[PDB]
Amino acid sequence: AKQDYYEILGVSKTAEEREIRKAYKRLAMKYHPDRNQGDKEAEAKFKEIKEAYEVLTDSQKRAAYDQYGHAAFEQGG
């Protein structure tokens, strides 16, 4: 559980959707269960890009997601 997430999709972290939209699809394709339901084990990989790249478009999360995993500690965020 010690792996970055902005780079997990070969990106820049400061990017936005432009790369997270070609990186999320370019790297998830390798797992895109929509077609790869023969195993569906990719369903979790989404937690690798969709859980990581989910904040690669915003900034307030870039500070939360880059260290507090996924809103780990958030009462009124």
Swiss-Prot record:
Domain J: 2-71
Induction: By heat shock under the control of the HtpR regulatory protein.
Outcome when changing Y24A: Loss of activity
Consequence the record notes for mutating R35A: Decrease in chaperone function
Disruption phenotype: Single dnaJ and double dnaK-dnaJ disruption are non-essential; synthetic lethality is seen in a triple tig-dnaK-dnaJ disruption, although this depends on temperature (triple disruptions grow slowly at 20 and 34 degrees Celsius but not at 43 degrees) and strain background.
Effect on the protein of changing K25A: Loss of activity
Subcellular location: Cytoplasm
Summary of subunit composition and partner proteins: Homodimer.
Domain notes: The J domain is necessary and sufficient to stimulate DnaK ATPase activity. Zinc center 1 plays an important role in the autonomous, DnaK-independent chaperone activity of DnaJ. Zinc center 2 is essential for interaction with DnaK and for DnaJ activity.
Function noted in UniProt: Interacts with DnaK and GrpE to disassemble a protein complex at the origins of replication of phage lambda and several plasmids. Participates actively in the response to hyperosmotic and heat shock by preventing the aggregation of stress-denatured proteins and by disaggregating proteins, also in an autonomous, DnaK-independent fashion. Unfolded proteins bind initially to DnaJ; upon interaction with the DnaJ-bound protein, DnaK hydrolyzes its bound ATP, resulting in the formation of a stable complex.
Family recorded in the similarity comment: Belongs to the DnaJ family.
Protein name (record): Chaperone protein DnaJ
Residues shown, of full length: 2 to 78 of 376
